[PDB]
Motif scaffolding. Structure first.
Motif, mmCIF file in Angstrom:
data_model
loop_
_atom_site.group_PDB
_atom_site.id
_atom_site.type_symbol
_atom_site.label_atom_id
_atom_site.label_comp_id
_atom_site.label_asym_id
_atom_site.label_seq_id
_atom_site.Cartn_x
_atom_site.Cartn_y
_atom_site.Cartn_z
ATOM 1 N N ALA F 33 110.823 -4.286 5.632
ATOM 2 C CA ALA F 33 109.559 -4.487 4.932
ATOM 3 C C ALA F 33 109.845 -4.769 3.470
ATOM 4 O O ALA F 33 110.768 -4.198 2.895
ATOM 5 N N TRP F 34 109.039 -5.632 2.868
ATOM 6 C CA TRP F 34 109.373 -6.272 1.606
ATOM 7 C C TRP F 34 108.333 -5.924 0.564
ATOM 8 O O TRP F 34 107.139 -6.037 0.821
ATOM 9 N N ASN F 35 108.793 -5.587 -0.635
ATOM 10 C CA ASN F 35 108.109 -4.605 -1.456
ATOM 11 C C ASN F 35 108.094 -5.043 -2.918
ATOM 12 O O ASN F 35 108.979 -5.770 -3.364
ATOM 13 N N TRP F 36 107.070 -4.614 -3.661
ATOM 14 C CA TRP F 36 106.935 -4.895 -5.086
ATOM 15 C C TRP F 36 106.711 -3.598 -5.839
ATOM 16 O O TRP F 36 105.912 -2.754 -5.417
ATOM 17 N N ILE F 37 107.437 -3.452 -6.949
ATOM 18 C CA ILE F 37 107.516 -2.230 -7.739
ATOM 19 C C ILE F 37 107.515 -2.614 -9.206
ATOM 20 O O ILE F 37 108.401 -3.346 -9.656
ATOM 21 N N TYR F 50 103.963 -3.418 -0.133
ATOM 22 C CA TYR F 50 104.854 -4.162 0.737
ATOM 23 C C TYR F 50 104.047 -5.002 1.706
ATOM 24 O O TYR F 50 102.988 -4.591 2.171
ATOM 25 N N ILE F 51 104.553 -6.189 2.000
ATOM 26 C CA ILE F 51 104.238 -6.891 3.233
ATOM 27 C C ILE F 51 105.435 -6.688 4.148
ATOM 28 O O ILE F 51 106.584 -6.791 3.706
ATOM 29 N N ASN F 52 105.186 -6.300 5.387
ATOM 30 C CA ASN F 52 106.320 -6.043 6.260
ATOM 31 C C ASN F 52 106.704 -7.344 6.951
ATOM 32 O O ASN F 52 106.340 -8.428 6.499
ATOM 33 N N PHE F 53 107.479 -7.264 8.015
ATOM 34 C CA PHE F 53 107.934 -8.477 8.662
ATOM 35 C C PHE F 53 106.818 -9.178 9.424
ATOM 36 O O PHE F 53 106.834 -10.405 9.533
ATOM 37 N N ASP F 54 105.844 -8.448 9.958
ATOM 38 C CA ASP F 54 104.793 -9.104 10.718
ATOM 39 C C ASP F 54 103.537 -9.345 9.894
ATOM 40 O O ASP F 54 102.427 -9.317 10.431
ATOM 41 N N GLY F 55 103.679 -9.559 8.595
ATOM 42 C CA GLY F 55 102.586 -10.061 7.800
ATOM 43 C C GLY F 55 101.511 -9.069 7.419
ATOM 44 O O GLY F 55 100.688 -9.392 6.558
ATOM 45 N N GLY F 56 101.454 -7.896 8.040
ATOM 46 C CA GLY F 56 100.571 -6.857 7.550
ATOM 47 C C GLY F 56 100.998 -6.377 6.176
ATOM 48 O O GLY F 56 102.168 -6.410 5.806
ATOM 49 N N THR F 57 100.026 -5.970 5.377
ATOM 50 C CA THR F 57 100.295 -5.603 4.001
ATOM 51 C C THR F 57 99.807 -4.192 3.742
ATOM 52 O O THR F 57 98.882 -3.713 4.398
ATOM 53 N N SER F 68 97.566 -9.054 -4.493
ATOM 54 C CA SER F 68 97.685 -9.616 -3.165
ATOM 55 C C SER F 68 99.102 -10.123 -3.012
ATOM 56 O O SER F 68 99.669 -10.692 -3.944
ATOM 57 N N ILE F 69 99.681 -9.876 -1.850
ATOM 58 C CA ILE F 69 101.049 -10.266 -1.555
ATOM 59 C C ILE F 69 101.015 -11.220 -0.379
ATOM 60 O O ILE F 69 100.409 -10.917 0.652
ATOM 61 N N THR F 70 101.635 -12.382 -0.539
ATOM 62 C CA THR F 70 101.631 -13.399 0.497
ATOM 63 C C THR F 70 103.058 -13.721 0.910
ATOM 64 O O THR F 70 104.028 -13.279 0.291
ATOM 65 N N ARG F 71 103.178 -14.525 1.960
ATOM 66 C CA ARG F 71 104.464 -14.764 2.594
ATOM 67 C C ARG F 71 104.631 -16.250 2.850
ATOM 68 O O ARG F 71 103.701 -16.914 3.309
ATOM 69 N N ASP F 72 105.809 -16.765 2.540
ATOM 70 C CA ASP F 72 106.202 -18.137 2.834
ATOM 71 C C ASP F 72 107.495 -18.043 3.627
ATOM 72 O O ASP F 72 108.572 -17.855 3.051
#
Ligand SMILES: *[C@@H]1O[C@H](CO)[C@@H](O[C@@H]2O[C@H](CO)[C@@H](O)[C@H](O)[C@H]2NC(C)=O)[C@H](O)[C@H]1NC(C)=O
Ligand SMILES: *[C@@H]1O[C@H](CO)[C@@H](O[C@@H]2O[C@H](CO)[C@@H](O)[C@H](O)[C@H]2NC(C)=O)[C@H](O)[C@H]1NC(C)=O
Lengths: 118, 106, 286, 286, 106, 118
Positions: F33-37, F50-57, F68-72
């Motif tokens: 899971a991918w995270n901002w601090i 964090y947004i995890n691997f399956d796009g939930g935030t 808001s955290i988005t994914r590319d």
């Protein structure tokens, strides 16, 4: 962890047999769950049962009323006694060490043949 | 839960790829370890969690499959890898093993 | 007349003999809680400490507490049936109202709420295989007692002063389901949003269920082969009774067990005070 | 008289207008299931996929199914109130019995059991944030329909042919709690001992709850940062919806979803057949 | 859950044992990582699970305590171990860190 | 895993700011899971989300409606945008990588100061 079990190489039918797996490396009450596994002559395997670190036991329900597993914490020993044996129970026996959080029987005793014979 | 490891024999030559298919009776959900019993020893753990691999093995071993079909696949079957391979669920007590598969050399 | 004691002893003698005189409502409830205690003893027999231990141990506790709650719905009956006899016996002036209320509470509520608590604990506590300590058996015993008296106290507080059993019965059933949801099992009380997480505290089976799983999870352990003190690369594991309690949101300190009971007894005193004030305010309405 | 169709259309017109003519039992239940749907929408609002997801998602499902079950207890009323009118209208011979029964089932049961199912699904399905797929919303919709008709069918099968509502009401409440325990939540149905684990199958909320958590857990995932496909040194973790289903003991294959519905419809046909035979056998008793 | 890392400063000489006590507001049950921020870097993970230790550290670091008191203890405080140490619960989102403790050299 | 975030070094108040953490080594949808601090000027830290691997935030509830955290997925990028900024939000920002089954924020971005200023 290093396991070594030792006991008789024979028992008369309709009696009890006792084995002891001396454990060096951990404590029996420290971490893992501690386990007994037979193996029929030839191929087939059969998990018999574990006593975990806190003394609770679980036995293979085929072996109801006949197995009991006990614990001797000071020498790091755990014992099986198998009551009302049968020459079916002529089998290689093993003590083996179950991790829990990995789920797999990670370490195994070296093995002793037990022959129920008249 | 009974496993069903079929067939119980193969005779495949050296340096080949061989495939063993353990079939459960229910869903066991990647709780499936492969054990590698030699002649005259205790079953050493080979594959844990049905995909991974315990350290101390030549990494030629590959556990695949999900659902109920599981499969140990050996690429470049060496001399040491003849033996008897027992699948073993650990989803729920009692932890039934498989019937085992005795590999053979051509 | 006599001041305080002889009249509550005498009226309590009357309704107490009336309960001994009626085997129907007594022994029907007794055989229901006995055979129900046996069935819960059979289904959950020998609670294992496997992965399936937690949701099984926290199952039966959530049953028993909630069982006691709706086993208090029959206690709606005891002030509504004799209501005409209550108002006729007060306009004639047989008694004082505090002597009546404290007398009738001694007659039916105090012994009959003791029996399914002690029967449940004694016949399910050893079939299930809960904690072998004797004091934990006592805390479960007393806890089912208090939650029975408190749910019954709410049943009196809503029930007293009405002529119809049924509307108060539906109203008590609705408030017991809305207290059922706010027990620990069915929502995870920690992750309610804060603007209505405050009303956890109005729920009686949170007090009962929280005590019964405070004294019974607290020493336990639930993953075989995993010691789980300072647990490492299992996180998320819930392999103690502590982690289930804190993850459920329950004060692991020993005061957190007994504040459930103080909240209980406080609800007993407030609810019976509400019924008492209903009797003093409706005694002359008649 | 007319053979089959005109009489059930005409009697179904009578009792259907009688239900439209009575806003009390209809609109009371409608406002209860609306505001109760709103409260379950508020408490569980925005179901997270944290560690606390599972016992929260499996909480609300266990509510709704079981809610439907006791929301069938009112369906005990519909054949017992008009019983004197039933026997008087049969000794005069207004109708055929299959025309009566299939007519009255069209009148009350078939529309009124449709409404809290579709209202519950439409107002709690998007507050809670269950699966965004449309067919899963349809399976939940139809599932709450079937479990409502089947619990109501058991309420008819026990209820039909009696004069007293209350004894059948207590008897239905006792069988619904003994079916409540054998749902997946409160016992872990896998680890019942085998000599009474067979009677899982007599429980209606296992069928409802098992379907509602079959279509709704099956794609999910519940440990943030843990992919948990081929999960390694977390074992014991329950970090999918699959592991919760299999650990709960539910056939993960797609037939295992719908055999719940075949078991449902089979219980509908058997229970209504039992009520039908009670009507043919008590129609001349009168 | 707010941590409370008190005090926020120490001035202990080289080669000593120093003790940092992170105090939670609830129970966090050994879910407590220590991070070791240098001047001008990102917080590197030091202690995971409140007892263990990530590999790549001089093993002079010892995380103890349970309940709510947790404690990082440094035997033989070296030069590299001045910095700012942030306890961090991860029992539940949001993962509040601590106020940090700026060690000093005597 | 190797993370590197890059964006503006300034934004005007009451606007939005966007940052991008290019990830090399895994896939964003693969495992973690991918995270901002963020980190306030001086000492204090604050996990943002964090947004995890399956796009939930999941977002820090102090920062409601504003992050808001988005994914590319193709470039292995994940973005923050922070709406309605304030010169409080002048802070060093970090992207960091959360394991899950270890629980600890194992890997961290190198860092970029973001100054909300008029
Ligand atoms: C789990 O393992 C821990 C060690 O990691 C055990 O805890 C310590 O054990 C030693 C000796 O075994 C004692 O001297 C300490 O007092 C123990 N400390 C604590 C905090 O318990 C622990 O005994 C193991 N668990 C069980 C149930 O035995
Ligand atoms: C979890 O990780 C697994 C890898 O261990 C992912 O599974 C494979 O992913 C690749 C590319 O990501 C695909 O080409 C394969 O088809 C996937 N195999 C299976 C069996 O799924 C998986 O994508 C990850 N989980 C999620 C939800 O993305």
């Amino acid at each position: 962890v290093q396991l070594q079990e030792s006991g008789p190489g024979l028992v008369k039918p309709s009696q009890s047999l006792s084995l002891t797996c001396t454990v060096t490396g951990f404590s029996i009450t420290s971490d893992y769950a501690w386990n007994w596994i037979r193996q029929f002559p030839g191929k087939k395997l059969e998990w018999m049962g574990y006593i975990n670190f806190d003394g609770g036991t679980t036995y293979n329900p085929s072996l109801r009323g006949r197995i009991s597993i006990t614990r001797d914490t000071s020498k790091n020993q755990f014992f099986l006694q198998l009551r009302s044996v049968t020459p079916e129970d002529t089998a290689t026996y093993y003590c083996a060490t179950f991790y829990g959080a990995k789920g797999t029987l990670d370490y195994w005793g070296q093995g002793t043949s037990v022959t129920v014979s008249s | 839960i009974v496993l069903t490891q079929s067939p119980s024999s193969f005779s495949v030559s050296l340096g080949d790829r061989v495939t063993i298919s353990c079939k459960a009776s229910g869903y066991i959900l990647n709780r499936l370890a492969w054990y590698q019993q030699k002649p005259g020893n205790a079953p050493r753990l080979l594959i844990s969690g049905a995909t991974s691999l315990e350290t101390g093995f030549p990494s030629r071993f590959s556990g695949t499959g999900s659902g109920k079909d599981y499969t140990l696949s050996i690429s470049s079957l060496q001399t040491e890898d003849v033996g008897t391979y027992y699948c073993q669920q650990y989803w729920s007590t009692p932890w039934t093993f498989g019937g085992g598969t005795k590999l053979e050399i051509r | 007349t006599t001041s305080f004691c002889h009249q509550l002893r005498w009226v309590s003698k009357r309704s107490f003999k009336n309960l001994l005189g009626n085997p129907q409502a007594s022994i029907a409830q007794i055989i229901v809680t006995v055979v129900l205690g046996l069935v819960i003893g059979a289904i959950y027999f020998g609670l294992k400490n496997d992965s399936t231990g937690i949701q099984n141990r926290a199952g039966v506790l959530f049953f028993l507490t909630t069982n006691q709650c709706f086993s208090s719905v029959s206690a709606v009956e005891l002030f509504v049936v004799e209501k005409k006899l209550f108002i006729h016996e007060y306009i004639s002036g047989y008694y004082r109202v505090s002597s009546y209320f404290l007398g009738k509470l001694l007659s039916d509520l105090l012994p009959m709420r003791m029996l399914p608590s002690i029967i449940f604990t004694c016949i399910v506590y050893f079939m299930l295989g809960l904690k072998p300590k004797a004091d934990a058996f006592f805390v479960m015993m007393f806890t089912l007692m208090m939650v029975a008296y408190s749910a019954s106290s709410m049943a009196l507080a809503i029930a007293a002063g009405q002529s119809v059993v049924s509307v108060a019965t539906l109203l008590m059933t609705i408030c017991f389901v809305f207290m059922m949801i706010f027990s620990g099992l069915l929502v995870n009380l920690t992750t309610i949003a804060s603007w209505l997480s405050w009303l956890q505290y109005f729920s009686i089976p949170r007090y009962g269920f929280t005590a019964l799983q405070h004294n019974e999870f607290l020493g336990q352990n639930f993953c075989p082969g995993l010691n789980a003190t300072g647990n490492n690369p299992c996180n998320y594991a819930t392999c103690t009774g502590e982690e289930y309690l804190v993850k459920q949101g329950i004060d692991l300190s020993p005061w957190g067990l007994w504040k459930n009971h103080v909240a209980l007894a406080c609800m007993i005193v407030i609810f019976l005070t509400i019924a008492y004030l209903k009797l003093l305010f409706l005694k002359k309405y008649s």
